[PDB]
Each structure stands twice: as structure tokens, then as C-alpha cells.
Amino acid sequence: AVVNTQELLDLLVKCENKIQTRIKIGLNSKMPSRFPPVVFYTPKELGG
Amino acid sequence: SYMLPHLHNGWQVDQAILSEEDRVVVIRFGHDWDPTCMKMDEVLYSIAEKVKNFAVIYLVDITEVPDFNKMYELYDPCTVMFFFRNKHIMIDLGTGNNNKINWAMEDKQEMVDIIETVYRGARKGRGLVVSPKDYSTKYRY
Amino acid sequence: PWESEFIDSQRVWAEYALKRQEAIAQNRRLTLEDLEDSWDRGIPRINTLFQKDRHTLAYDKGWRVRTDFKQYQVLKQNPFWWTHQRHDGKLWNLNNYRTDMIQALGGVEGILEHTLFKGTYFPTWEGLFWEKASGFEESMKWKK
Amino acid sequence: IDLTLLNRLLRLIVDHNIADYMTAKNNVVINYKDMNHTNSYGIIRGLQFASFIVQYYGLVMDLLVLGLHRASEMAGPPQMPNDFLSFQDIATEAAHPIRLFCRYIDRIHIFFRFTADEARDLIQRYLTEHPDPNNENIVGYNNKK
Amino acid sequence: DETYGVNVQFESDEEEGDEDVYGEVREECTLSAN
Amino acid sequence: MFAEIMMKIEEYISKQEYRVIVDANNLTVEIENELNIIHKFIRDKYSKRFPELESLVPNALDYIRTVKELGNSLDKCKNNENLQQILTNATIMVVSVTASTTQGQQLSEEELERLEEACDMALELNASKHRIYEYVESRMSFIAPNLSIIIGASTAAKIMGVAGGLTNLSKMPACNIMLLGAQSVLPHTGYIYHSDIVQSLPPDLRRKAARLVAAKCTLAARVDSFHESTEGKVGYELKDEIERKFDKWQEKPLPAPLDGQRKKRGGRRYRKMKERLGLTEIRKQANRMSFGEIEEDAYQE
Amino acid sequence: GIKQNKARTILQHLSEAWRCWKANIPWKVPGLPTPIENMILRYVKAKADWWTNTAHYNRERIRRGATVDKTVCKKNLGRLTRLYLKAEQERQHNYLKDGPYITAEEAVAVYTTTVHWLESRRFSPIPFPPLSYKHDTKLLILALERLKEAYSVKSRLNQSQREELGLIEQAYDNPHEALSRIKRHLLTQRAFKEVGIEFMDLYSHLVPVYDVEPLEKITDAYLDQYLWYEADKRRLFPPW
Amino acid sequence: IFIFNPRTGQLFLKIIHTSVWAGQKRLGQLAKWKTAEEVAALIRSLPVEEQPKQIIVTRKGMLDPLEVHLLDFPNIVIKGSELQLPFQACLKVEKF
Amino acid sequence: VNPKAYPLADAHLTKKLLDLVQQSCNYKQLRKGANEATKTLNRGISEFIVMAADAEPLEIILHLPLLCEDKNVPYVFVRSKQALGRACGVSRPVIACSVTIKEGSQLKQQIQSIQQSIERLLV
């Protein structure tokens, strides 16, 4: 039902970017350009 | 109302800063009828007897005491400056300037932690402490 | 997908029923070697057959209504309000998500070029470990 | 949930001391920080057995919703009971408008099937009790937007 | 035999994965209105 | 027994030793369960006329007055001023509602007159009980004023009688007047455990309260074994003390954030100071994350 | 001559009357003079109407999806908890005033429908758990395991939660004193302790969350596991 | 505790009383760290010329508490043993 | 003082009395309290009773003279309950103490001398 709901897929990337934006403004208050996904998506054992 | 005490000239302010040897002189520079200063004085009143073991809170009207307007750059509605043993304690809040607070925080625990940080870094001797929060973003979600 | 989950649960608990009656015919117990192809499969997972507490969980009736009503007792919001790990098993598996994620971000060493790992001069990353909240104050987790 | 009625309904299915406990457990003081009130009407919903009280009171209201005849057709005979959406016979299935019924915790889902006669007799009984000269039934009609 | 004198060793053993040890499927009046 | 006792009571109230007092008190606390006998008889005999007044009026004297009020005729739940002296308007409303639908047959004339004389002797027992109560409270406030003020004059007369008078009640300790009137219902309880002032509190607040009422009334008993405080000021003061303790049982800034001077001495006490809470932990593979490997299933956390 | 001592005290009287309004408790200061009392009452009514309105307005703001911070939601949730409990106390007192809302013939209709169902099902009623009940240790282990599952450790539980953990591990130690205590509670305990309430703030709606005293939680959890086991055993709940 | 020097034959055998663990109310969470702290207190008792720099544990569940209790002595080496030596035979001789 | 407190020990006798009551507290021969003095008078194990003249009201121990005449036990009133309470090894005021008989205890000569001395006071 997620793959069928396009409103939920839009909301899912909106909330994912919201979580990533809170991580990024916890890093630096200036919102970056081209922030690497590697710091978010790396597993916790490998540091991410 | 504002049961916090008031400095009505430059002598009352400078001797109120020089009065304390082991407590942070927290001074609000603003007008009691301002809404920003009214909320900031509500926050300072709700913690005035919490932090009484390591701080003192004074209110200062800008119209009544205008001599600190140029030196302390009191050009915002409320400013909250922190002093300890005559030294002006600056705080890297993240707002861009470190000298004053210059807005009204609504969390009284954040004001308790800012005063507690100023106390810990000032008895250690720093003129600049780092706030235990970053106030550059308003953290609204 | 849920449709795939239900047809594989139907056909896999059918296979368990035939394997169970042929293992009662052979007087033995169903081991891990049969039911290894059925493993992360079934809506009660086949995993749940091999639990120590399983007999105890045969007396936990009404547990799904209980997990729904945990929202009026526990302030922590449960995202798995609908299931329990004990009774249904783990109805997902993201181990290959983690492997394909490591491979997509560039491999382990393609990840570690974004890090201070080569500044640590560890000759390889294999024998290493973190210290989760050890710090400089020895964590001091417990203090006033 | 009337706790007198809930007490009497529970005394049917459980021990009378168990039912007296479950009802007296719902007639307690509910307390926030400074404020507290005696909960005498409803159930407290975060008792551990409130899951049982809700499903049993919901069963009672399913007997109100289905009737004893259709609830007995849906549950089957007590000797060989039916599973969820199954009847003994397809004639037992088609013997009522209510084909399917699923009560969740508090949500009911009732699937009906009508003929033209059954539907227009039900519509005529409704429009006898709640007449609609304006075709004013389309307005408050919830849809799935 | 008496065998008087026997060591004990208190250990924090028995850590496992909470599945079965040997990997087996171990299986073992009415109301009336008048 | 009622004639032998209460004609002496009538002779003593018309004059306005203590064996008549204790016998009157024992009589009236037997009157209450004799009234329970009469009430259960009336409940069994009237329920063919009205099988619902037991659940609606469970109070025994109100039930007796409302089935002496009604009888066969449940017409007298309508506009009844006489029933308004007995029950609340809520109770009158609900007995009128269930007298509209009674499912009860009428009585006989012999059955109605039998129930009538049963209710009449029940009111005779109730008025006799209250007459005994008024006499025993008057004569016990004259005989032992302070004890009557503390406990209540009926229980004061009971514990004065089973102890054997005031001058035997004084020279008893406080630990025996608690168990005075004792005998599987509650153990180590006396007449002053089943007092109204000791039951005026939660059930776990009870036993200790007995020791509070047993001691102070003992003082009161000693205080009125000699004939001082005839007005009862010692009883008033001690009773204020009793319910003051009953109400007593019933229902700072932040420190300046200095750091420690520090722990500069070690071992001894300090290893126990950490063995309480910050003790010898695993210190290996419990504080670690194991950089390369994934040891669990991947995102279980 | 009097306002140089009295003024701080009347501010504490203002804040105390407001705290007593927020708590649904009586505020009558006997030594306070009734014009000052009437002005504090007036202040409390004005702040009450503003407070109710700003709680409902901030709730429509939060529920609509407008961007708020942590202290606005925390403050809002406290305001709505006190307002929802004022409404709930008014609901309970309306039940005590307006009688049982279900009529006597309505109640016996519901009841006879239930007895005709349970006679139709040949339902044998769930008995009291016997003394050497075969599964009472199984249901007790499931009950205490379920109560333990309610604790994920941030590592900091309060006095009552770690006291609950102590009572659970004590019932793990001697399960039969626990089962005897539970059956004693199920037989005789009819007066209980205050159930704490708070509200899980989902932003669409407030979910009530109840903290029961842990001895009562253990008795309730065993009763829950027992009744659900026996009702599944007796097929009380039909498959719908 | 049998603390046997191979080279000097000086066996430091510590007597552990019955009253140390008859009424201790503890698990092996006292036991491992207790035998480790007492052999560390032996190490702290002796002078630095007589302290060892290599300690061999027979039973493998003791080198991990010995790592913790000997952080005052990082100069010493705590290895396990693949060869176990029967020092219960010392218990079996009547003198010891 | 209270005129019903009779006999009343003078200063030398009450010094000997409080030292004997202190020694009996040490020798575990002492029962503090008016109810415990009433008990050990009823059991007949009391050597002698001391009481406190500054007990208000006095009559909460004035049953104890009558018990000391029905048990043949010497009784005497100390000046104040605070000194008697401290002489029993408690900081609270104690208004009535019972020095009791024990199995051949070493205070029996002091207790006999104080008995002979405080039966001279009631005269």
C-alpha cells in the first residue's frame, strides 16, 4: 500500500529529508549544498 | 509587576555587578512593558529562586538607565547580559553575537542551563563560554 | 509484499503440516534441517517453532489485542502495535539491505574514504571496535 | 461502558469475584499531577484486562448489530464453529443481508448484499422514517477522497 | 566414596540465541436462561 | 428481659448502681441483631407482595417503615406525604416505578396483619433501642464523662462494664483496654476497635488507631476514676488530640554547580562507593560496537 | 504602609488561585478579603478563558501541521490534559447526576441478548483460577514478561517503575506467593489506588495513557492473561 | 589461589575462607573479580623486583578480570594456558 | 507542686532515687511508663514505683498509689517528669517508673535501702 500510495512516497522522502536536514543543521547551521549521503546511510558499525 | 529588582541609574547597575563575588549577575536590559521583555522576565522570575545559589537577576530599564546603550550595544528590545566578578561573560549561543542573549527564550530550563554554563565557565575563568544548545535555528518542527 | 507473504505462509505452513505428520510417522521431531527452506517464511514465522519459550507462548492468548491496548499503558508509541516478535516472528529482514547499502555507498573502503579512518593509521578495519559512550570521563553515565 | 451493566455482563462469562474485581478496578480515582476524579462511568482502558472488557462488550454490541440469528449463522454451531469469513452452507451465507462482519477493537466492518427487493424495502423503510424530499442525502455522505 | 573436597566455579554461562538447544520443534456447566 | 431492664430504665429516668447501665447496653446491642431477625422475616414475608423493595431499600428500618407504609396497596407511592418522611424522593420515584411493574401477588389479611404487627414491634425495638441509647449516654456522661467524650458513651459503658467499673478500668494498662471486649473475624480487637471513631478511617489505618484510642481513653478512665474534670475538659482536649493525629495520618533551590574537590584518596571505602553503583562492569565487548562485523540482525537495534 | 509587605503575597495568591483552577480543586482563602478575592476570581476567569482558547487554538495549529517547537507542544499537551480531565470530570459528574444512561429495560434487553447468545453457544463460564491451576505459572510468566516488555532502558526509570521491576522479579523468584497474592486481590480487593493518567501526544489526537500501581498491575496482567486464555479455550470471542 | 612460580618455585597459595562466600549474597560477579583483586593485592604487596611481568591463568575465565584489576601494572602480561596443571593435587597432599 | 502527689521525695532522696532508677535502667530492672508500672504492679514483680509530681493531669498516675497499697509496694513522687525521664535513659518525659525484682541482682541492697527510705516519706 506504500508503493501504491504516491502521496505516502512524497511524504516519505519529505520526512526523510526532514530528518537529514535536522542532522545537517546539527552539523552546521548553514544549510549545505551537495551534502553526501554516505554519512546518513552508512551502517552504525561502520561509523555512520 | 516584575518582582525582579531594578537598577534605576548607572551606579545601581555597576555596583550591582560589583556586589557579587560568587554569583552570576544576570541583567535584563529592556522595558517592562515590552512583550519580549515581559516573556523574558517571566522566564527569569520562574527561575530566580531556583538559581539563587549561583546567580542573581536584575532588571534594568533602558529609558531609566541609558548610559549602557552605546557600550553594551543595547539596541534590541530585551538583552540579557551575564557578568561574574566585574567581567562580562560572553556566550557563543550561535546567534552571531556572543555578548547578549537579545531575544526571549521560552524554555526556563534553557535559561537555567545558560546561567549554569556561565557560572561554570566563569568560576573557571573564561570570558567566553559555549551555550549547551545552538540558538541559530529555532528548532521548530 | 503482503500478498506474497500470505501465499508463502499458506503454502509453507502446508509444507510444515505434511512434514510434521511424516515426522510423527518417523516418531522423531522436526529438526532444523527439514524446515530450513521454510525459514524466514510464514506469517507466524517458522522461526517461532524453534523457540524455547514457544510452549509458554501457546498460553498467551489474545496477545494482539494486548499489543494494541499497550498504547493506553505505555507512553512509548509502538510502531509494531500490530505484531510481536515472539509470536509472529520477525516479519522483515534487512540484512541484505545493509549489505547492499554498504555496496551501494562504495564498499567498506569506499565508505571509509569519507571518514577519518586513514588518519587513524589502522592497517586494516577488520579487528577494530568502537567504544559506545566511553569518552573522556569514562562515560560517567551514572552521576548526579 | 456502564460499569453496572459491564459487571452483570461479565458475571455471565467469568467468576462473580473476577467480575466484581474487573468492575471495581474501573471505578477508581484517575489522577493527573494536581487533579483527580473518580472514574465511575467509563472503563479505564489501560488496565491490562481492558482488552478483554472491550472485546467482550464489543461482542455484546455485535449481538446487537447482527442479532442472535445472524451471529449464530456467522459463528456456526458451537460444535463445529466457523472460521472468520465462512458459513456452514452458502444458503446460510445468503440467508441474510449481512454477508460479512468483522469487528475490530471498536471498528465494525459489515458487508451487506441486497437484492433489488431487499434494498428498496430497506430504502423505503428509511425514507418512511427519515424522508428525503430534497435529495439531501448526498451532502453529508463521507467518501474516500 | 566420601569425596570430601569438591571445587565449584561460579560463571556467567548459558548465553545463547534463545532458540531451541537441539534445533527441534519440541511439541507436547454451561449458561442457561430459564 | 426488656421489661426487667427498661422498667428500671424508666424508674431511673423518672428520677431525673451501674449494673443496669451495662445490662442496658448489652440489651441494645442485642436489639440490633434481633431487629436484623425481624427485618429478614419481614423481607421474606413481604417479597411475595413486593420482591423488589429489598434491593431498592436495603436499609432495615426504612424498609420496615415503607412496608408498614404500603402493605398490599402500592397505591401509596402516589402523592404520598407519609412516604416522603421515610425515603428520599429518588427512592420514592424508583419504588413507584417498580410498583408499577411488581410481578407480585397480594397478601392475605392474616399475612398483612402479621407483617403489620412485625413492623410495629420492629419500630418498638427501634424506639426502645434509642431510649436505651439516650439513657446510657446521659448516665455514662455522668459516671465517666471523659471516656464517653473520647470513645462514645455506649462503647464507654461497654468497656466500663466488662472491665468491672471505673475503679477497675483505671488500674488496667493501655494494652489491655485495647483488647477489652475481645473473644475468623479480626484478632486482637476489643470493643474500641469496632467503635465508630476507629472505623472512621481506611481499613489499614485501623489497628494503630486502636492503640491511639486505647491509650488516651485509659488516661481519661484514670482521670474519671477520681472525680476531677467533671465538665469533661480532659476528654475534649484528648479527643482533639486523637482526631488531630487522625488528620495527621490522613490525606529548595538548585545547588551551586561546583565540581568535586576531588577523590584524592583511594581503595578502602571508595571501592565500596563504586561497588554500589559504578562497579566492576564487563569493560570489554559490552561497551564496544565491533567496527567491521554486524553481530545481530541488521536494523533490529 | 501595607503594600510594601503584601504585594508579593497577592502575586502568590494569584498564581495559587490559578494553580487551583488548573487542578479542579477548591480555592477559598478564608483570610483573603472578598474584593481582592473577587478580583483574583475575575483574573482566574479571564486567564481561564484565554487558556482554554489558546490550548484549543494551539491544538488546531499543531494538528493542522503548523510548525511548532518542543515547549509549545509540551505546554499545549499539559493544557489539553487539564482541559480533557476537566471535561472528563464533568462527564463523570454528569453520569452521577443523570443516572445510568442506559435504561433498565434497555439494560435487560442487552443482557438477555447476551444470555441467549451464551446459552446458544453452550458457553461454560470462566471459573476463578483454582489453587493448583495447571497453567497459573505459565500465565504468570506471560504476564510478568508482558509487563517487563514495557521497559526499554534509556536506563533512567523513576521510583515506581524500578519498584515495578522489583515486584516483577520478586514474582519471578517465588511465583506461588505471587499467585496467592493475586488470587487474594481478585477475591477481596475492591478499593484500589489512584490510576495515573497522562496523554500520549499524537498530534492528531490525544491518546490516554494509564499508569496503574504495580501490585495491581501484576494482578491485572495475570487476570488479563488468564481470562484471554480461558476465553480462547471456551471460544468466547467468535472469529469476527 | 595457587600462584606458582615455575622458575623460583615460590608457591603463593592464598587461603580463601568459608566465611568469604558463606553469606556473601552474590553471584560469580563477585567471585571472578574477587580472586582477581586478591591476586592483584598480592602483586601490590610484593616489591617491584619481585613482582612478575607475565601471569598465566589456568582457567580461561580469569584473564578478563585480571585485565581490569591490573591496570595499575600495565607492564605485566596476562596470557591464558593451553596446558592445565593439576594444583588440586596440592589440595590432595595432607600438608597443604 | 501538686498536693495530691504524696509522698514527695526531697532533693537528696530524689538524687538517690534517680541514680537507682538509672542503675536499674542499666541492669534492665526498670519498666518505664505508667502502663508498664501498672502491669508490673499487677504481676507483683515491682520493687518500687517512682512517679512524677509534674504530670499534667496528675490523675493519670494517681491510680498507681492505690495499686501500691493493694500490692504492698513502696511508691514515691519525683519532682518533675523530665528529670525522671532522663534518669530512665530516654530523652522523653516519663511520669511513672517501676523498678522491678530480678533474680538476685546486685541492686537489691540499694533497692532495699531506698524502699525503707521511701516508706518513711508517707507519714
UniProtKB/Swiss-Prot annotation, chain B:
Signal peptide: none annotated. GO terms for cellular component: cytosol; nucleoplasm; nucleus; spliceosomal complex; U2-type precatalytic spliceosome; U4/U6 x U5 tri-snRNP complex; U5 snRNP. GO terms for biological process: cell division; mRNA splicing, via spliceosome; RNA splicing, via transesterification reactions; spliceosomal complex assembly. The disulfide bond seen in structures determined by X-ray crystallography and NMR is not essential for protein folding and function. Disulfide bonds join C37-C78. The modification Phosphoserine is found at S131. It holds the Pfam family DIM1. Keywords: Cell cycle, Cell division, Deafness, Disulfide bond, Mitosis, mRNA processing, mRNA splicing, Nucleus, Phosphoprotein, Spliceosome. The keyword Mitochondrion does not apply. Plays a role in pre-mRNA splicing as component of the U5 snRNP and U4/U6-U5 tri-snRNP complexes that are involved in spliceosome assembly, and as component of the precatalytic spliceosome (spliceosome B complex). Belongs to the DIM1 family. This is Thioredoxin-like protein 4A. It comes from Homo sapiens. The gene is TXNL4A.
From Swiss-Prot, chain C:
The modification N6,N6-dimethyllysine is found at K52. The modification N6-acetyllysine is found at K90. Widely expressed. It is found in: Nucleus; Nucleus speckle. Plays a role in pre-mRNA splicing as core component of precatalytic, catalytic and postcatalytic spliceosomal complexes, both of the predominant U2-type spliceosome and the minor U12-type spliceosome. Functions as a scaffold that mediates the ordered assembly of spliceosomal proteins and snRNAs. Required for the assembly of the U4/U6-U5 tri-snRNP complex, a building block of the spliceosome. Functions as a scaffold that positions spliceosomal U2, U5 and U6 snRNAs at splice sites on pre-mRNA substrates, so that splicing can occur. Interacts with both the 5' and the 3' splice site. Part of the U5 snRNP complex. Component of the U4/U6-U5 tri-snRNP complex composed of the U4, U6 and U5 snRNAs and at least PRPF3, PRPF4, PRPF6, PRPF8, PRPF31, SNRNP200, TXNL4A, SNRNP40, DDX23, CD2BP2, PPIH, SNU13, EFTUD2, SART1 and USP39. Component of the U5.U4atac/U6atac snRNP complexes in U12-dependent spliceosomes. Within the minor spliceosome, which acts on U12-type introns, interacts with PPIL2 and RBM48. Core component of U2-type precatalytic, catalytic and postcatalytic spliceosomal complexes. Found in a mRNA splicing-dependent exon junction complex (EJC) with SRRM1. It comes from Homo sapiens (Human).
UniProtKB/Swiss-Prot annotation, chain E:
It comes from Homo sapiens. The gene is SNRNP200. Widely expressed. It is found in: Nucleus. It is linked to Retinitis pigmentosa 33: A retinal dystrophy belonging to the group of pigmentary retinopathies. Retinitis pigmentosa is characterized by retinal pigment deposits visible on fundus examination and primary loss of rod photoreceptor cells followed by secondary loss of cone photoreceptors. Patients typically have night vision blindness and loss of midperipheral visual field. As their condition progresses, they lose their far peripheral visual field and eventually central vision as well. This is U5 small nuclear ribonucleoprotein 200 kDa helicase. Contains two helicase domains. The N-terminal helicase domain has catalytic activity by itself, contrary to the C-terminal helicase domain that may have a regulatory role and enhance the activity of the first helicase domain. Belongs to the helicase family. SKI2 subfamily. It comes from the Eukaryota. Disulfide bonds: none annotated.
Curated annotation (Swiss-Prot), chain I:
Ubiquitous. GO terms for cellular component: box C/D methylation guide snoRNP complex; dense fibrillar component; nucleolus; nucleoplasm; nucleus; precatalytic spliceosome; protein-containing complex; small-subunit processome. The keyword Ribonucleoprotein applies. SUPFAM superfamilies: L30e-like. It comes from the Eukaryota. GO terms for biological process: box C/D snoRNP assembly; maturation of SSU-rRNA; mRNA splicing, via spliceosome; ribosomal small subunit biogenesis; single fertilization. Changing G33K: Abolishes U4 snRNA-binding. Keywords: Acetylation, mRNA processing, mRNA splicing, Nucleus, Phosphoprotein, Ribonucleoprotein, RNA-binding, Spliceosome. The keyword Ribonucleoprotein applies. One of its GO terms (molecular function) is ATPase binding. Residues 31-43 are annotated as: Interaction with U4 snRNA and U4atac snRNA. It holds the Pfam family Ribosomal_L7Ae. The modification N6-acetyllysine is found at K16. It is found in: Nucleus; Nucleus, Nucleolus. The modification Phosphoserine is found at S117. The record marks E56, K81 as: Interaction with U4 snRNA and U4atac snRNA. Residues 91-123 are annotated as: Important for U4 snRNA-binding. Changing Y75A: Reduces U4 snRNA-binding by about 50%. Belongs to the eukaryotic ribosomal protein eL8 family. Identified in the spliceosome B complex. Component of the U4/U6-U5 tri-snRNP complex composed of the U4, U6 and U5 snRNAs and at least PRPF3, PRPF4, PRPF6, PRPF8, PRPF31, SNRNP200, TXNL4A, WDR57, SNRNP40, DDX23, CD2BP2, PPIH, NHP2L1, EFTUD2, SART1 and USP39. Interacts with RAD17 and PRPF31. The complex formed by SNU13 and PRPF31 binds U4 snRNA. The complex formed by SNU13 and PRPF31 also binds U4atac snRNA, a characteristic component of specific, less abundant spliceosomal complexes. PANTHER family: RIBOSOMAL PROTEIN L7AE FAMILY MEMBER (PTHR23105). This is NHP2-like protein 1. The gene is SNU13.
